[PDB]
Amino acid sequence: QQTQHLDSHGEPTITSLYTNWYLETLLRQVSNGHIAYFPAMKAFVNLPTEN
Amino acid sequence: ICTEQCTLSDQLLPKHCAKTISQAVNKEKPGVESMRK
Amino acid sequence: LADQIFAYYKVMAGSLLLDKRLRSECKNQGATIHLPPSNRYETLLKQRHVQLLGRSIDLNRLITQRVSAAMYKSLELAI
Structure with a gap:
């Protein structure tokens, strides 16, 4: 049931929370230039910005 | 018990x-808690 | 060329799986693990028309044989 976007009882599941976090904190920050896609490490790495 | 195991x-x-x-480059552990003195 | 290609690929593979938190902690403590510099071996890997004295040499086949031997040796060493 954790795989579905909503469990039987009708509460948020881990998959939905992870999707929301990834779409609203990780990918959103990339558009601001604070994070970039590093193909060498096959992962997103924070830039060496002052913030 | 689950919290303790985690x-x-x-x-x-x-x-x-x-x-x-x-320590090696610039030159308590697990398992001890399971020993029964 | 085959030896250095295999070494670079193995180093990159090992670095990829290394935990990032451990690397950050080591860097903070003063024991940074240097990353492997990038390389452009793919161009040589995709070469099948090396011409020398009228001979066409399939460099890819030789590199494949060498990497296969190296992988077998590494697996045997691990076992």
């Missing part, structure tokens, strides 16, 4: 071995 297990994560790598 607390025991988290000690095995790689992040706890940084000090050992640093």
Whole structure:
């Protein structure tokens, strides 16, 4: 049931929370230039910005 | 019991071995709690 | 060329799986693990028309044989 976007009882599941976090904190920050896609490490790495 | 087991297990994560790598380059452990004196 | 290609690929593979938190902790403590510099071996890997004295040499086949031997040796060493 954790795989579905909503469990039987009708509460948020881990998959939905992870999707929301990834779409609203990780990918959103990339558009601001604070994070970039590093193909060498096959992962997103924070830039060496002052913030 | 699950909380205790998770607390025991988290000690095995790689992040706890940084000090050992640093000591060798710049030159308590699990299992002890299971010994029954 | 085959030896250095295999070494670079193995080093990159090993670095990829290394925990990032451990690397950050080591860097903070003063024991940074240097990353492997990038390389452009793919161009040589995709070469099948090396011409020398009228001979066409399939460099890819030789590199494949060498990497296969190296992988077998590494697996045997691990076992």
